[PDB]
Amino acid sequence: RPTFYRQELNKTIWEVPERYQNLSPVGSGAYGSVCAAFDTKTGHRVAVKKLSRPFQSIIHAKRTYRELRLLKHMKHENVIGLLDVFTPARSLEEFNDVYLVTHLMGADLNNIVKCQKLTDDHVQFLIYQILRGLKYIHSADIIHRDLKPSNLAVNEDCELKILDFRHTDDEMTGYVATRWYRAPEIMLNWMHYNQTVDIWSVGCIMAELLTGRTLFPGTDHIDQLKLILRLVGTPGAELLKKISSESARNYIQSLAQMPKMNFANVFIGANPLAVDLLEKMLVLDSDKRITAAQALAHAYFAQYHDPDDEPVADPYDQSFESRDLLIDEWKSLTYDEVISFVPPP
Numbered sequence: 436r437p438t439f440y441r442q443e444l445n446k447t448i449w450e451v452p453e454r455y456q457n458l459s460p461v462g463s464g465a466y467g468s469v470c471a472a473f474d475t476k477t478g479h480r481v482a483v484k485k486l487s488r489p490f491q492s493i494i495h496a497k498r499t500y501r502e503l504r505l506l507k508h509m510k511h512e513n514v515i516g517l518l519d520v521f522t523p524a525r526s527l528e529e530f531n532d533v534y535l536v537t538h539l540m541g542a543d544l545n546n547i548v549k550c551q552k553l554t555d556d557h558v559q560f561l562i563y564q565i566l567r568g569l570k571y572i573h574s575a576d577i578i579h580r581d582l583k584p585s586n587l588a589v590n591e592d593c594e595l596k597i598l599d600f601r602h603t604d605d606e607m608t609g610y611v612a613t614r615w616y617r618a619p620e621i622m623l624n625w626m627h628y629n630q631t632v633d634i635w636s637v638g639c640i641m642a643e644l645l646t647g648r649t650l651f652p653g654t655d656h657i658d659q660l661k662l663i664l665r666l667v668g669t670p671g672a673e674l675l676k677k678i679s680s681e682s683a684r685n686y687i688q689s690l691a692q693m694p695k696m697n698f699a700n701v702f703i704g705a706n707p708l709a710v711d712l713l714e715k716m717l718v719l720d721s722d723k724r725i726t727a728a729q730a731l732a733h734a735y736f737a738q739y740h741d742p743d744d745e746p747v748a749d750p751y752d753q754s755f756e757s758r759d760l761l762i763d764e765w766k767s768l769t770y771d772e773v774i775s776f777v778p779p780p
């Protein structure tokens with residue numbers, strides 16, 4: 436057991452191992468209770484997160500367990516990983532607080548996309564890295580569900596990682612970036628969705644890196660659907676059959692039919708190979724979208740593609756998701772995952 440020390444950070448008593456020095460808050464509350472620190476064991480600048488109210492309800496206790504299981508699994512160059520997890524508790528009986536430690540990057544994609552001139556080579560390398568990380572995430576049967584520029588971290592060499600492993604009705608309402616990258620089948624609860632929702636999001640991100648502009652900046656759910664159908668066309672009878680929501684199917688049929696637009700006339704002057712890949716990602720029927728594994732072999736990525744260095748994940752057991760347990764049973768499972776942590780090489 437390391438020696439712990441105490442200090443007051445943001446109205447809060449933090450108790451951390453001596454290896455972590457110079458703690459100072461970051462994110463202005465956006466990430467939760469998170470501080471930058473210097474890690475004296477590794478020499479890295481790190482992020483230390485102190486969970487708030489981790490075991491306050493059955494729902495909160497299960498969310499704590501889910502977050503720690505996902506972060507312990509993810510071991511890939513293009514995905515956030517866990518450097519450490521600790522508690523100052525010396526037994527299950529006195530366990531209350533959980534702290535998570537990760538690498539901390541320089542900025543998110545929103546900072547670069549808003550403030551930089553991006554070449555076609557920059558767009559090739561950034562989207563290649565998102566797809567390499569997604570091939571790994573999807574191989575474990577994990578769905579991200581929230582890919583957007585604020586969840587993609589980058590360092591000065593243009594190397595990228597995927598963040599955020601919840602959302603409320605109020606959070607998805609009106610003129611908000613929280614909804615602009617969502618696939619239409621999840622935005623409007625059309626059907627049981629699957630991993631194809633993440634490829635819609637990558638298409639929206641790619642289009643914005645190419646133009647400097649949000650692809651579908653809707654003022655509300657209905658305005659955003661009208662922007663999507665003007666580009667990709669209204670649904671045909673095959674996709675309408677698959678909308679298992681009757682009232683959603685009825686509303687779609689009230690709209691005048693529109694053909695798919697010419698993407699070379701929308702993305703004026705872009706690499707033809709980028710236009711081709713956008714046409715394969717931004718397909719209304721999720722069964723017909725390109726997968727991450729197929730997209731890595733597309734000619735747009737010929738400069739970066741290496742089929743011997745695009746790894747897949749170990750198997751991930753998510754059977755706990757269908758399990759009904761008491762608060763103390765979720766808290767005991769979380770404790771065992773804290774004490775069993777093995778740090779990376």
Ligand SMILES: O=C(c1ccco1)N1CCN(C(=O)C2CC2)CC1
Pocket residue numbers: 466469482483484515535536537538539540541542543585588589598
């Ligand atoms: O690198 C970044 C970053 C840079 C720009 C936006 O996010 N992050 C912050 C959020 N993180 C956490 O809160 C981890 C639980 C510690 C660590 C990774």
Ligand SMILES: [Cl-]
Pocket residue numbers: 437438452453454455
């Ligand atoms: Cl220490």
Ligand SMILES: [Cl-]
Pocket residue numbers: 514515516517537538
């Ligand atoms: Cl990492």
Ligand SMILES: [Cl-]
Pocket residue numbers: 522523524529530531532533
């Ligand atoms: Cl504790």
Ligand SMILES: [Cl-]
Pocket residue numbers: 545583584585586612
């Ligand atoms: Cl964003």
Ligand SMILES: [Cl-]
Pocket residue numbers: 750751752753
């Ligand atoms: Cl597992």
